[PDB]
Amino acid sequence: GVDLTGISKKSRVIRHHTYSTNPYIKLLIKLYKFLAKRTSSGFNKVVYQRLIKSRSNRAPISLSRIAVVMKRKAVFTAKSKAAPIAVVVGDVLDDVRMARIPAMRVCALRFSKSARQSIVAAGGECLTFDQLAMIAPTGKNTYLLRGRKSGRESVRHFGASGVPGSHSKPYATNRGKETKRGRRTGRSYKRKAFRHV
Amino acid sequence: KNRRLRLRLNPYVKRETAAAKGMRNVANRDARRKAKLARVTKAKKAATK
Amino acid sequence: QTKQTALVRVENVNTREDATWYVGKRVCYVYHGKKVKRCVRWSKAPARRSTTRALWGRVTRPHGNAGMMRVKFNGASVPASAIGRRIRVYLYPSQI
Amino acid sequence: AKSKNHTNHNQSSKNHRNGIKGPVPLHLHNSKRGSWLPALVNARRVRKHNQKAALKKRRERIAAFAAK
RNA sequence: AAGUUUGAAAAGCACUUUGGAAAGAGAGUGAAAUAGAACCUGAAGUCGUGACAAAGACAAUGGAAGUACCUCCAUUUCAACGGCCAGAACCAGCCCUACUGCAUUAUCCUGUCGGGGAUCAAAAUCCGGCGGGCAACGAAGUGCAAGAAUGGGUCUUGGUGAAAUGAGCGGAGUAUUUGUGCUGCGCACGGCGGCCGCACGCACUGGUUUCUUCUCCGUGAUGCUCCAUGUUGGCGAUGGAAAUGGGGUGCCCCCACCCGUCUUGAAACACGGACCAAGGAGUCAAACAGACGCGCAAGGGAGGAGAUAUGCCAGUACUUCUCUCGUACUGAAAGGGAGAUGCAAAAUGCAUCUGUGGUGUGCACACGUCAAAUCCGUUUGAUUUGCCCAACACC
RNA sequence: UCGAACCACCUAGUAGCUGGUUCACAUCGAAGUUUCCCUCAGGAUAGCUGGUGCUAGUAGAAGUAUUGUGCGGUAAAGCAAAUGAUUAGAGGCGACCUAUUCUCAAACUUUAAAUGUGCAAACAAACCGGCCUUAGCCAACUGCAAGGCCGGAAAGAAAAGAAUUAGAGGCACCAAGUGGGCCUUCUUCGGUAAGCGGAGCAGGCGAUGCGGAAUGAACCGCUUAGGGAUAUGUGGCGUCAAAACUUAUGGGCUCAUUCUCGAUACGUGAAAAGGGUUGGUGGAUCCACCGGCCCCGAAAAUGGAUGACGCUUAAGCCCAAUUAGUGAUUGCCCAUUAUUCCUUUGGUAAGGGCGGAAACAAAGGAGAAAGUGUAGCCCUUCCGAUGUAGAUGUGGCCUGGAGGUUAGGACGAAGCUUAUGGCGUGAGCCUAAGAUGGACCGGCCUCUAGUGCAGAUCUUGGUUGGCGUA
Ligand SMILES: [K+]
Ligand SMILES: [Mg+2]
Ligand SMILES: [Mg+2]
Ligand SMILES: [Mg+2]
Ligand SMILES: [Mg+2]
Ligand SMILES: [Mg+2]
Ligand SMILES: [Mg+2]
Ligand SMILES: [Mg+2]
Ligand SMILES: [Mg+2]
Ligand SMILES: [Mg+2]
Ligand SMILES: [Mg+2]
Ligand SMILES: [Mg+2]
Ligand SMILES: [Mg+2]
Ligand SMILES: [Mg+2]
Ligand SMILES: [Mg+2]
Ligand SMILES: [Mg+2]
Ligand SMILES: [Mg+2]
Ligand SMILES: [Mg+2]
Ligand SMILES: [Mg+2]
Ligand SMILES: [Mg+2]
Ligand SMILES: [Mg+2]
Ligand SMILES: [Mg+2]
Ligand SMILES: [Mg+2]
Ligand SMILES: [Mg+2]
Ligand SMILES: [Mg+2]
Ligand SMILES: [Mg+2]
Ligand SMILES: [Mg+2]
Ligand SMILES: [Mg+2]
Ligand SMILES: [Mg+2]
Ligand SMILES: [Mg+2]
Ligand SMILES: [Mg+2]
Ligand SMILES: [Mg+2]
Ligand SMILES: [Mg+2]
Ligand SMILES: [Mg+2]
Ligand SMILES: [Mg+2]
Ligand SMILES: [Mg+2]
Ligand SMILES: [Mg+2]
Ligand SMILES: [Mg+2]
Ligand SMILES: [Mg+2]
Ligand SMILES: [Mg+2]
Ligand SMILES: [Mg+2]
Ligand SMILES: [Mg+2]
Ligand SMILES: [Mg+2]
Ligand SMILES: [Mg+2]
Ligand SMILES: [Mg+2]
Ligand SMILES: [Mg+2]
């Protein structure tokens, strides 16, 4: 025997295959597994891992956010160079709060119809990953982006709302029911809003 | 124990074994013993005197 | 007990050095059955046909300090009905 | 019937199975709420001035870069 | 409780004979009587009969390894041929043997003088001085050890050259250079107070060759993977054959407390346990949440109902307003209601609209630099600077 | 049928309590403790465990040292020092004072360990000189405080014994079982004591076999995929029973007459007090003293227990060896352990190949899938493998029906029988035979459910030993 106490606690849970049933997703996974194995770019490896990931971990992104980050990168770029291609492993959605945008080249798994119309009208192009693999096989001159995950209702609900320093929402259908005792100083006590950690 | 592996790991082992055989020779042993005893006795006597 | 190794006591072998001389020698156990079955040279030498049968083995290593030897039999193991009965130890293969 | 009252026999082993985790480093969660108020107020005025200086500095870097 | 579920059709057993009868033995119908009347199939459990295996009293059952006898089973082989059984030889690897040098010895070894002891007189055990030292036979029960250039086992492993990488195979030389011995200069080391010693330490790869030892070159895959190759006898010449695996019964040596359960603790003098068949226990609906799959996305989606293909069709195809969840929250309530930058400081200030409110830590990408490796084309790591996506912390 | 009749219904009344709960492999794997509860045979809550992951893969690491710097009042010691007890003599003078003297304290202490415990040991940090801001301090500031900007240096931490790592850090979500424990080592409290009750630290059994102590949950050794070879651990080498076929060319001691000396680690027999042999201190010219082994002290209930026989030039007790003053280094036996070889299975797994190189008819052969999971796309390499309650996975097995697709059957479907073999780790699948049967039914991909039995004093039917017995 060999003393290997608590050795199973160093194992990590990682997904090695997709749970999706989409044949086009499977084709993309095949192509980018080949590219990641046979090239020396970190871009391909990151893209392959994100393609493997699940739907909840592939949050969508906003066209306005894309425009803002592209502008903040472009303000410090020489005028003799071309703007990078935005790349999102996920969905791109339109934004009504911003009406004027520059011409951008965007590659994504899926576009909403409004977002596609807005990009084309501004004067950009919508690309797919198979087109990207031919335009830039190693991912040179790209801009990898992710969508926002905090702000989801589930995240806002995570935790216990009755302990000091917590601001999570309780699971309740009647908004006016869980007030009074434990939430007001006049009713016995009030949950403390702040606590040093 | 394996001859080719030992030679592959250490190319000087041939010289080492040749020296070992030369030491284990009998006439060499007798001559060295006599000479060493004489040398050490002379050195000790000279150091004392 | 561990049945795939057998212990054999040989006459006039009473030291461990004596038992070393017999390492590698062939060993035979002779018994008889109930019916006449096939044997070596069944057709070449019909006079050998009999109910007599034999099991063969070899000596592997000494056992203890008193000249006992360990014996391995070809394939299967020797039957337990052979305990306390005669064992032949031949002089071949010869090292002399 | 009577039973066992109290013991601490196995508790140390349970606490070390997932280990006793160390403290959070000092540069994280260093909130100043509840500290001496007069010093807190004065520090707020300085931080407000620094933010305005940071915005001005970025504009100068942009203009210089455009001029090459 | 209980399917009259014989058979296509009653063709539902005429006739002989034994019996009081029930029935039996023949004969006959029918494709079947092993379909003979509540008759398709006809299991398990239990019982009778014939043949065989044996077996003391270890309750029986059970495990592991053999053997005797059997086998309505499977597969293989039957000729310069075996996928069967044995013996020996060689190759690679591994395992266990024999063969052994360097340091050390002094409380020691040996003579001689003295005293000391004992004897019948001696010697010897023992104690001082002085002079020499190697107890060296296989010296020593002592501190290390590197001796296979090259003895047997592997039915405890693979093979017979279908890549042999070898001090081992092949080729060419037959000389190199390891140690021992002797010895030069300078330094180092010990003693005395610079001189004297150096057991042979470091450098000069210092000299000498007296002994000791072999040395130098060589075969990529144009093979991605698996399988396919020696020698000598026995058995096998198509049989009621041989051989190798399965299967059955007995026997020997060894091993071995009765299952399920509650319990700290069961084999128990703790409970449930005669046998077999069929049956027998986490399901359906509604509200909520998390993980995962799918569609659309600042929007998503009904439901009820209608309309006509539609009059085969309880399905599919189509539809408007509306309704619902969400894009905004907060207060008991009357109520109110969230951009950035610049100038400025107005009890609703003014101006622009390509834009992360700020700071710290932070994928990828872009610009440089340094290492290591390289088939020289490039790779693998670090780091500088810029922007920093997701995210965390402080404002 | 009565300390409240009978019949039907509400009624499948409720049960924190008793009983039951149907296929196989694989990866992991506990708790009987905290707080609250009309709570003590139950719950909620945290802890222990599984699954799912997210994040820039060596990061903000450690049940361990070293160096530096803090904390402490147990063990011991003391009463000639404070508090509290306590014996006697002496001096000054019956009492008192003065120094002593004998013995002590869980709720007494001047002093004070060993084991402990907190912090630090250069990458969001620390160090050294510009500047900006503050409604902070001070009589003022170019002094102190705070937030920033610019620049420099950086054995990336020398030398003195001057760390090490089978050393990837951090962050979440969902949920099970458990909440009767027991034993041992050291420290202990109550009790005469207990296989008794109650605690502290650690290791175990529970949940676990295997090898030893004859036998034993907890003792000793060791911890577990399926098999060989070699070597050991604890324990042993007179027979039972493998090993000194009763080893040595080792030294001493011991005689035990009816529970019959001794060979009993834990532990499973023995006190005060006494006396045959063999040793040692002192004193004389033979006396006291105290050790080894043995003996007395030593009385029970079925016949019996160093495990049995037996053993006395031990096969007993205390030392000490390995073939014996001869030549220097391992006597022998036995594991689910160690080393090594073969095979399986799973990884936080690590690599290579996958543009068909060329050529090739019968009368050297085949294969070569860009791949979680298979009859695994193929090859090489390394590591792990036990487990109750419990969690999860499986191109994992089986049953009745539905949508598709592909077959079979009077030259014989389903069902039934088996010394019918073959395959698979297994659930199971397939073939053979029927000297059986007489009309339906198999494989594969999806869908669906009244879907798997050995036991519930389980339900219904049949059978059965007792038994040709009472
Ligand atoms: K003399
Ligand atoms: Mg939001
Ligand atoms: Mg309790
Ligand atoms: Mg019939
Ligand atoms: Mg019938
Ligand atoms: Mg029957
Ligand atoms: Mg003398
Ligand atoms: Mg050669
Ligand atoms: Mg049993
Ligand atoms: Mg009990
Ligand atoms: Mg039981
Ligand atoms: Mg009992
Ligand atoms: Mg009961
Ligand atoms: Mg709407
Ligand atoms: Mg309208
Ligand atoms: Mg909202
Ligand atoms: Mg309102
Ligand atoms: Mg109010
Ligand atoms: Mg009555
Ligand atoms: Mg019920
Ligand atoms: Mg009831
Ligand atoms: Mg209860
Ligand atoms: Mg139960
Ligand atoms: Mg485990
Ligand atoms: Mg209450
Ligand atoms: Mg109970
Ligand atoms: Mg004390
Ligand atoms: Mg003291
Ligand atoms: Mg006192
Ligand atoms: Mg140092
Ligand atoms: Mg309980
Ligand atoms: Mg008790
Ligand atoms: Mg239990
Ligand atoms: Mg154990
Ligand atoms: Mg005993
Ligand atoms: Mg024996
Ligand atoms: Mg005595
Ligand atoms: Mg006895
Ligand atoms: Mg006795
Ligand atoms: Mg015994
Ligand atoms: Mg393995
Ligand atoms: Mg397991
Ligand atoms: Mg059904
Ligand atoms: Mg049978
Ligand atoms: Mg059912
Ligand atoms: Mg049944």
* String of DSSP letters for chain C: --TTSEEE--TT--SHHHHHTTTT-EEEEEEE-SS----TTTTT-GGG-SSEEEEEEEEEEEETTTTEEEEEESSS---GGGTTS--EE---S---
A84: helix, coil or strand? coil
How many other C-beta atoms can be found within 10 angstroms of the C-beta atom of residue D12? 9
Q: Residues with Cβ < 8 Å from A91, sequence gap 6 or more? A: A58, A60, A61, A108, A109, A110, A111, A112, A147
Q: Residues with Cβ < 8 Å from D24, sequence gap 6 or more? A: A197
Structure tokens at A93: 């959605």
Q: What is the resolution of this structure in A?
A: 2.4
Structure tokens at B41: 């006795």
- Which experimental method was this entry solved with? cryo-EM
**C-beta of residue C90 within 8 angstroms of C-beta of residue C27:** yes
Residue A164 DSSP code: T
**C-beta of residue B17 within 8 angstroms of C-beta of residue B10:** no
CA-closest candidate to residue A50, choices A128, A145, A117, A177:
A145
D49: helix, coil or strand? helix
Q: Which residues are paired to A61 by β-bridges?
A: A92
Cα gap B44→B48, rounded to integer Å: 6
Cα gap A26→A23, rounded to integer Å: 5
A64 burial class (0-12, 13-18, 19+ CB within 10 angstroms)?
Answer: middle
- Tell me which amino acid residue A142 is: T
**Which nucleotides in chain F have some atom under 7 angstroms from a protein Cβ?**
28-29, 31-34, 40-41, 47-55, 60-63, 124-125, 132-136, 145-148, 166, 168-174, 180-183, 197-204, 222-224, 228-230, 242-245, 323, 331-335, 337-338, 347-349, 370-372, 384-385
Cα gap C19→C26, rounded to integer Å: 14
Structure tokens at D66: 């455009």
At B45, which helix (H) or strand (E)? helix B26-48
Cα gap A154→A159, rounded to integer Å: 10
**Which nucleotides in chain E have some atom under 7 angstroms from a protein Cβ?**
64-70, 86-88, 93-95, 100-104, 133-134, 136, 146-150, 152-156, 165-168, 177-182, 197-200, 211-215, 234-236, 242-243, 251-254, 287-299, 341-342, 353-359, 363-366, 378-380, 386-395
Residue A76 DSSP code: T
How many other C-beta atoms can be found within 10 angstroms of the C-beta atom of residue A70? 20
CA-closest candidate to residue A48, choices A35, A61, A60:
A35
Cα gap A41→A48, rounded to integer Å: 12
**C-beta of residue A193 within 8 angstroms of C-beta of residue A162:** no
CA-closest candidate to residue C52, choices C66, C34, C68, C70:
C34
Structure tokens at B19: 């020296």
